[PDB]
């Protein structure tokens, strides 16, 4: 048991963690070698020592090449994860954020009512996904 | 002459007699034969005919992106593989294969609408070289793509099946196809 709700096992550690919303394909390997286990190693082969090192990084913050790093938060007083954000936390925050500025006329809130892009990326041909 | 300052043509026996007259191992057309490497893997065998025409057909078909810079490593690094495997000169084995993959009589096509008129034309030496290497590389690039095999292992394995004679080989089999339809529709 590492995650909130989910649990990995049996398959290679990179494949086995992909089923988590918060740990993907080229995002599993990030946390894996920070614990200090390899990619070929399967998640059902893990020793207690190896199991402890992986969950410590994964629930608390993740990184890559970060020499400058503060920990400021939202300023709006809903929640405040902002370390690393796993399954049950990423489905909550990202959901109700969209609803708060949709309640008012933010223009990002009205693009959430439409269907069209929120950032506004070259809008003519894109729109078959969003 | 000396190919990568070791192997030459003086330790090589030649099979087809008319290829002695035309294609000379001086430079036109260079009778030193070797190709079959990508990355680092020492497989088994080597072989691909005429190094001048391994700049030619072998390059563009590949299978590789990149042109000559790829090709010169394919040519060079496979020389050592066959040297310790069958204990042969890398040129000698495929001086057998070049005449087997090169037709004597071929067929032209001329397209009169949706009609393929295959009529016979004679070959003789020069075209037999490059059209044979075209036959090797087109079968090799597609066999690297369509099943799990690198261009290293594909080019390598092919040419002893082409040299001795087997229906596993592409190049002797398509040589048969083009040659026998010429002597039929003559």
């Amino acid at each position: 048991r590492l995650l909130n709700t989910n649990v990995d096992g049996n398959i290679k550690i990179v494949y086995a963690l992909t089923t988590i919303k918060g740990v993907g394909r080229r995002y599993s390997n990030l946390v894996c070698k920070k614990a200090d286990v390899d990619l070929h190693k399967r998640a059902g082969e893990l020793t207690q020592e190896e199991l402890e090192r992986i969950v410590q990084i994964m629930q608390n913050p993740t990184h890559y090449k970060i020499p400058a790093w503060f920990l400021n938060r939202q300023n709006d007083i809903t929640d405040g994860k902002d370390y690393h954000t796993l399954a049950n936390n990423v489905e909550s925050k990202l959901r109700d954020d969209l609803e708060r500025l949709k309640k008012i006329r933010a223009h990002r809130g009205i693009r959430h009512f439409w269907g069209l892009r929120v950032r506004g990326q070259h809008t003519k041909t894109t729109g078959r996904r969003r | 002459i000396k190919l990568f300052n070791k192997w030459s043509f003086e330790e090589v026996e030649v099979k087809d007699a008319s290829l002695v007259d035309y294609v000379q191992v001086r430079q036109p057309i260079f009778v030193a034969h070797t190709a079959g490497r990508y990355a680092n893997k020492r497989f088994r065998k080597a072989q691909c005919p005429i190094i001048e025409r391994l700049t030619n057909s072998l390059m563009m078909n590949g299978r590789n992106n990149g042109k000559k810079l790829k090709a010169v490593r394919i040519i060079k690094h496979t020389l050592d593989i066959i040297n310790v495997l069958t204990d042969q000169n890398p040129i000698q084995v495929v001086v057998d294969a070049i005449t087997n993959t090169g037709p004597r009589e071929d067929t032209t096509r001329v397209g009169g609408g949706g009609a393929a008129r295959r009529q016979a034309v004679d070959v003789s030496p020069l075209r037999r070289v490059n059209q044979a290497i075209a036959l090797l590389t087109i079968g090799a690039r597609e066999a690297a793509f369509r099943n799990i095999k690198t261009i290293a292992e594909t080019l390598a394995e092919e040419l002893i099946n082409a040299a001795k004679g087997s229906s596993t080989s592409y190049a002797i089999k398509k040589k048969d196809e083009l040659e026998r339809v010429a002597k039929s529709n003559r």
Partner: protein, 141 residues
């Protein structure tokens, strides 16, 4: 010999062994927060943990070019269109690495500051380079 006679990569590895011995050069702890947080396993030559291998590279470049600038030993001189440019505006990841490395090498007596901007390489510097280049060359022959 000189630094030219020995190869590029393996000189940087060989010099890095002696670099760790000298306790003026410490790790301010930046590259242990990148290679582990990746997936990347790099074995002990490739490894760089980190100020030892990077100091050996930077100091080699003051033999090979020699002229001024901490900035012109940070990125070669101009072209950081690959990876990230930083000239006037406040210095980033690459910045805080190389300002520290030539500061720490100065506290040995490896690099000195020449009066037309920035660094050269001095007496104890090129001793610590090319004497190690000789030892590696004897292992090559």
């Amino acid at each position: 010999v000189s630094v030219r006679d020995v190869a590029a990569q393996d000189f940087i590895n060989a010099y890095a062994s002696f670099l760790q011995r000298q306790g003026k050069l410490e790790v301010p702890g930046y590259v242990d927060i990148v290679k582990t947080s990746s997936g990347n396993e790099m074995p002990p030559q490739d490894a760089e943990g980190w100020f030892y291998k990077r100091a050996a590279s930077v100091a080699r470049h003051i033999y090979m070019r020699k002229q001024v600038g901490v900035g012109k030993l940070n990125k070669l001189y101009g072209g950081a269109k690959s990876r990230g440019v930083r000239p006037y505006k406040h210095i980033d990841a690459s910045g805080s690495i190389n300002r520290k490395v030539l500061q720490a090498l100065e506290k040995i007596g490896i690099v000195e500051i020449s009066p037309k901007g920035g660094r050269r390489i001095s007496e104890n510097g090129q001793r610590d380079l090319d004497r190690i280049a000789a030892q590696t060359l004897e292992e090559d022959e």
